[model samples]
Target chain A: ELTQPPSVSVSPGQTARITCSANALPNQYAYWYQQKPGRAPVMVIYKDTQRPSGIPQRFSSSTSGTTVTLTISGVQAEDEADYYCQAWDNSASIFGGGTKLTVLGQPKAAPSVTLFPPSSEELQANKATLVCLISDFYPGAVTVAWKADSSPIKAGVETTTPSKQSNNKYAASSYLSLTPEQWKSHRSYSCQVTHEGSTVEKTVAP
Target chain B: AVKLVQAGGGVVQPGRSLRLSCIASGFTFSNYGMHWVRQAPGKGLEWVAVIWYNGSRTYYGDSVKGRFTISRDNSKRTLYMQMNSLRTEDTAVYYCARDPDILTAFSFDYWGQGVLVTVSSASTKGPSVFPLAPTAALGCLVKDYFPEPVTVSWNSGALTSGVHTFPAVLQSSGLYSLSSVVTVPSSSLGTQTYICNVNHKPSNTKVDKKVEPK
Candidate 1:
């Protein structure tokens, strides 16, 4: 059995989830632990990261954020886990309750991003080439495509590859080509990329 | 309800030392003890140690026994801990907590905000010197201060000439602060040297520093 550790980040005035997942042999159970300074770690979630007795319902856990989200809905001082998540393995159990959190006031707004172009782009007939790029993505995942107005163009589209960076982010690129005269007059060239529920578009002129 | 707060975060280097504090408020200081805990990124928490308000009692987890110390100030309701001889595995969130009043053995009731500390230096004490390949870059930070510029260099352990440059910032007190971020092919970085030369400088000089992932 194997378990993936939770991914965590904090923002102010909102609930944050620390998540982890376990893959185990049948009958194995998972547990969550909370460890603060100067005290022994206490079990908070048992056998699936469930809240233990006396723990409030607001201190909930779900299989999100990866495989589980230890959700502190309306976070109070005691609600801070510093670290919290699910843990399981065939050989032994591990605790995912991470550090103790002290609220440093509230966090800024949740981080997000935006892209241009709703769908496809129209281009002139004489253009020699059309290039496309996508930017401004967080925990990045971007995909690019090339089309001739309404239909997909196979040979016309260049490379479709993604450049990945740290912090779970990525960038994607693609290109297309046509005669200069066609680019000048053609109105069927379009390049697009989809990311985080938004689409960015670009058009070329011949 | 009583509460505790912590300061910001810090970055240290391997083989160096770090000290952080937790200040409590709205609580009776002498009635409870403060403990320290650590959690690596995405991992479960681990007990580090604890201290009583009077600065008298201390307990350490067997895993971290010789590497850490906990102390406290009764008058200020503050607790402190220091970790020495740092290493990369020590990177994690550190928290302080108040002991619960109940008789259910020892457990934390309230906790201080957490601070994430990271160690940022590569080890060079190993035996070998090699040239750096052009395809890779080296990351380094001057964690300790010597009277002279210590020879910090990177190589593939094969003695190839590689392009190297230094990017540094100076402190307000006029001390030269240096750091570099290098990307070596994952394969070449396996057994390389991010060497720090201290032989030329005065032995008495000591400056804590690190070179972490940028």
Candidate 2:
């Protein structure tokens, strides 16, 4: 089997090296493919380091022992894509767990967070659904968690994947469902969103 | 009880314009945002525009950002979309859906039937079908399809109504998935057979699935 890193990043004009570990013969050839979200994968490297037709020369590969490495030199914004490595073990083929390559340049904008209280209609029905909307963040990724009176609450919480807005920023929402009794019992509720090491929290109903 | 009823769609010539309308009923129109989405023939779903709750702001998709205008009249409880400079690629079905929260939400829990706006002419494809028995209604989950145009009708031996088909959602795998549901009331569910007939256009291929009576 082939194993790869979950993610790797690099500054524009810099080089990024993503290594793939394999338990196959040293003579086995390695193949690398590049893919973007909602698109088909394109083979960038085959037979260890041979670039296919139309593929840029910035993408190269090397093999050492049983490990293979894909290196992207002078990475650009368009070079940011998920990459996968494939190798053969006897008659069977193995593919690596794809790695996301993020080329850095764009400003890291923080998310604007807002927390909305449960609607009266839901409260009248014996349950409460608190919503947290987070928007205007760059890079389109964030981790969200809910809190009741300063403590973390995990159950009945659902968060959506980040979606790109018309302004090119990203937005996402989270929902916290609980019984009306449990909701009123807590003095306050907070929605915490973390992006690129920074955390922002919005609280409602003090 | 949330429902949306849209006006009928008509054939529009290339380079011409059309106005699409959807009436919001069974829910407070001014409380939730309304979205307009379109799908080209044999293609996945694409966002067209959105009107915010209270009709304060409107946003649009990239391709139609400058070409389409989305507005609403809260008094009439209706949403409108004005599309311009139609092209063959613009031939698609436009749907109006409700967005629970405009800022932090992307769910189209309730949707309009859909308006087929075929610009000049286009092509379509067939979809793979699967039977679904959700918690509430008997449904057919159609996926790996294209052009966002499909017909889902149920046959319960005689005749059946209360059919609802959602707008197709595009997956990251570059395929689309749509689901249609039919209500089966009373004790007839176990005694009567329900079949979902799907008419996927362009190729005009018709596929059907039967939900065994239970």
Candidate 3:
């Protein structure tokens, strides 16, 4: 539990006893902060054990042998943020960098995705664009693929980079382009989203 | 709660100077750093500059470095940005934000709304047009231009389709980035060279980029 890896990675419902091994002696108080992606670091615990007004009960702290430990109880998806510890002396105060925290889960099963067909604006111009919105996947690493099936056909597929959501899950978008006659045939298309070996496909009709 | 409000939006012509303001409320103003950012019509986000809450120090984005100055007023609970040598390309919505990372330098996470600035004939910057490729029928990524509404067109002697403009996105430096897409079908693929044209009505200028089918 005292081991300080370069980072601390865990799964949901798991507790991370992140102990900051301070080389120096402690003062009368210690604090813990939680930093979320793109957000600011908020003090989660103070006085070595008290949870602040807005902080949830899942976060608690304790000190032993010059090391201050921050324990996350029932770590949730949103709890995947970085946690940091700080200590102070009468004259000075010091803290360490953000010890990274990541949560990896199997996502239960294949998560759901919605495939939207080409818009009327895109179709009227003899060109069509289709979109697939992927959501609710854990960790990172999702594989997206396109295929022509069910009702009909395909072409002109382009996908942007996957975006990470605040929920600690991942989201991404994929696009498919087509000519007028190609979509006119009522051809169908599909999106394949695979995460950590689990796969789900969502299809749309033009 | 820590709320931010941006003010001072107007239509200024080329070569004018602007001083935009952001007002902070709901929290101790000096507890966090106030920073300035801007967004062009439909471009990616860019970092601008920062003024620490206690009126301590300042930092700048590489693009707006020498051309902009950042300051904060503790009594007024506001942050100020003084920008000069304006151009049409500089037209955008300016915003102010506060970051919790007092220990860190720059942050774009917490933001106020924005103030729009339009420069007439002031924009001299050109558009950057390129193909987004991973072996698919390419879509174009057009970035960094000014004086809103740049007409995009593609002509490859019977190309797949016409140009489609996406909404403009704002940047931190009060500029914009736009994405326009056109598709070429497999049947239309060959050795022919395709041209992407971006025209700005304000400066009455245009930019042209070319790509050949692979």
Best by lDDT: 2
Q: Tens digit of lDDT per residue, candidate 2, span A153-180?
A: 9987656556666677777766676888
Give the Å shift of residue B1 in candidate 1. 4.6
Q: Write the per-residue lDDT of candidate 1 for residues A77-194, one digit (tens) a residue.
A: 5554445443333212234434344433333222221211211222222224343444334423344566666666777444333333343343443445455554545566677665
lDDT by residue (A1-206, candidate 3, tens digit) is 12233356678888877887665635446666676654445668866787778888888888787777888888888887766665544322345554667776555334457665654444555655565656656554466778777532334544443445556565555566567786666556778887757779877765
Regions of candidate 2 where Cα sits further than 4 Å from its true position:
A1-9, A19-31, A47-50, A62-68, A85-98, A148-155, A181-188, B1-214
Per-model fnat list: 0.12, 0.00, 0.00
DockQ by candidate, in order: 0.06, 0.01, 0.05
Please report, in order, the local distance difference test score of every candidate based on alpha carbons: 0.50, 0.70, 0.62
- Model 3 docking tier (incorrect/acceptable/medium/high): incorrect
Candidate 2 docks at the CAPRI level of: incorrect
Q: What's the TM-score of chain A alone for every prediction?
A: 0.40, 0.71, 0.49
Among the numbered candidates, top DockQ falls to 1
Candidate 2: residue A126 lDDT (0-100):
65
Model 2: clashing residue pairs?
Answer: B41-B147, B42-B146, B42-B147, B43-B147
Reference-based TM-score, model 1:
0.37
